[PDB]
Design a protein around this ligand. Structure first.
Ligand SMILES: CC1(C)CC([C@@H](Nc2ccc(-n3cnc(C(F)(F)F)c3)nc2)c2ccc(C(=O)NCCC(=O)O)cc2)C1
Ligand SMILES: CCCCCCCC/C=C/CCCCCCCC(=O)OC[C@H](O)CO
Length: 423
């Protein structure tokens, strides 16, 4: 039956957007409700969720206006259609920043953490404590003798120093120092169990402490190390604030303690970057959506602009999205090369956030951009292609699943809350 086919596809479409709307509101409520989920990653998720929620609101509004001049001739319809077009471009560009954030998350590590904290020195300098230092936090000897310090650096670099050391030599010594730090931790009886239980991010935090203080130094934090091994992060944060380390160097200590408490790099992020993300996800759609609306209002205005087959006006809305998908696939490829690298070199386990986040984002990219690339310049089997509506309806539900409901951290929050109710 012809009419029966159209009706049944209508049902699956509307229940797709119903399940998606409900799931996205529930998932955003989870991300906002639990305080431990308040990190930049989940904020980016919340903006993506909002774009999908608004898309669903447009769908329900268009459907609800069918009940009670026809609706195709009104201007309210053209406004709802323009808002929906905006939401679609927002989906694709917040997916773009999702991918960009993932890439930079894979590019940050202990080496960059320490290059921020310790600084770079070109010449020998006598630090406040009496130690001569150079490079990236490379302390030589407390011996108050510039002559002997330059010699001690000469044997530890290979060539004659004279005082000035190039950037390459400093990076070489920096790798040496970081490897010594990890070998120290694994050769310590009070630090190996906790380091082996920590995730890569909190591992880098522990290494940071060892790079500043020392192997036997941080082993003195008996009280904090025990509760770090017990997954009780917040207790250990407040405990680490009551330290000599926190009062001597507070700005570095707060960054490291944040990394322990949350397991993220948020304490090393620049805050204008997130504003550039919001200027991409919400701002750039505004930059090609509204001229399309202007030209469709002045030069192609017939039935809420549904007859979009005349001129270049279809391209000014489809070339930007193609752009956002092209880059999204290039990111898609590059990320893969990185992840399989870091997994093979045992720099990363499949239990870390970078891998799980790639496990979701690498799914969504070819799930949302492959249609746009395949039919790139095609303007316009009927039942079989009407199955695009089912997937575009269930898109937001899948976003809520892959970015909330199967996330391990939120499942932790639910079990922790039930445990609080029992005890
Ligand atoms: C629709 C499906 C049938 C596909 C989906 C599935 N996709 C998926 C699974 C594995 C790899 N993968 C492995 N190795 C590589 C390599 F090569 F390294 F890149 C990629 N890639 C893609 C999926 C499963 C599990 C999750 C998941 O737990 N999310 C929560 C993690 C989080 O948000 O914190 C997400 C997606 C399920
Ligand atoms: C709205 C219209 C519906 C269309 C929706 C169809 C989506 C099906 C995906 C096709 C992938 C094609 C290109 C993907 C590239 C292959 C790479 C790959 O398989 O990924 C490896 C990694 O391990 C895990 O993704």
């Amino acid at each position: 039956s012809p009419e029966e086919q159209l009706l049944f596809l209508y049902i699956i479409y509307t229940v797709g957007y119903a399940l998606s709307f409900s799931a996205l509101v529930i998932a955003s409520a989870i991300l906002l409700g639990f305080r431990h989920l308040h990190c930049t990653r989940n904020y980016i998720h919340l903006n993506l969720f909002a774009s999908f929620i608004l898309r669903a609101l447009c769908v329900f509004f268009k459907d609800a206006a069918l009940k009670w001049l026809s609706y195709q001739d009104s201007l309210a319809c053209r406004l709802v259609f323009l808002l929906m077009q905006y939401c679609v471009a927002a989906n694709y560009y917040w997916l773009l920043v999702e991918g960009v954030y993932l890439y930079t998350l894979l590019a940050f590590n202990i080496f960059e953490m320490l290059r921020i904290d310790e600084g770079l020195r070109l010449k020998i300098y006598k630090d406040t404590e009496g130690y001569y230092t150079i490079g990236i936090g490379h302390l030589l000897t407390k011996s108050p003798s510039l002559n002997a310090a330059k010699s001690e650096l000469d044997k530890a670099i290979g060539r004659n120093t004279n005082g000035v050391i190039t950037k390459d030599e400093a990076e070489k010594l920096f790798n040496q120092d970081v490897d010594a730090a990890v070998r120290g931790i694994l050769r310590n009886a009070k630090l190996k169990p906790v380091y082996d239980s920590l995730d890569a991010v909190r591992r880098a935090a522990l290494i940071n402490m060892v790079f500043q203080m020392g192997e036997t130094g941080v082993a003195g934090f008996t009280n904090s190390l025990r509760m770090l091994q017990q997954k009780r992060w917040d207790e250990a944060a407040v405990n680490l604030a009551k330290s000599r380390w926190y009062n001597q160097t507070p700005n570095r200590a707060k960054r490291v303690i944040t990394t322990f408490r949350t397991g993220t790099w948020d304490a090393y992020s620049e805050q204008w970057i997130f504003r550039l993300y919001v200027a991409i996800g919400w701002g750039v759609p505004l930059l090609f959506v509204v001229p399309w609306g202007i030209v469709k209002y002045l030069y192609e205005d017939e039935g809420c602009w549904t007859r979009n087959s005349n001129m270049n006006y279809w391209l000014i809305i489809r070339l930007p999205i193609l752009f956002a998908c092209i880059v999204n696939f290039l990111i898609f490829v590059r990320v893969i090369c990185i992840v399989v690298s870091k997994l093979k070199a045992n720099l990363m386990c499949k239990t870390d956030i970078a891998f799980r986040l790639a496990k979701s984002t690498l799914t969504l990219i070819p799930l949302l951009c492959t249609h746009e690339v395949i039919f790139a310049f095609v303007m316009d089997r009927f039942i079989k292609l009407f199955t695009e509506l089912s997937f575009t309806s269930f898109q937001g539900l899948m976003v809520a699943i892959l970015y909330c409901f199967v996330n391990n951290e939120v499942q932790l929050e639910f079990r922790k809350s039930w445990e609080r109710w029992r005890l």
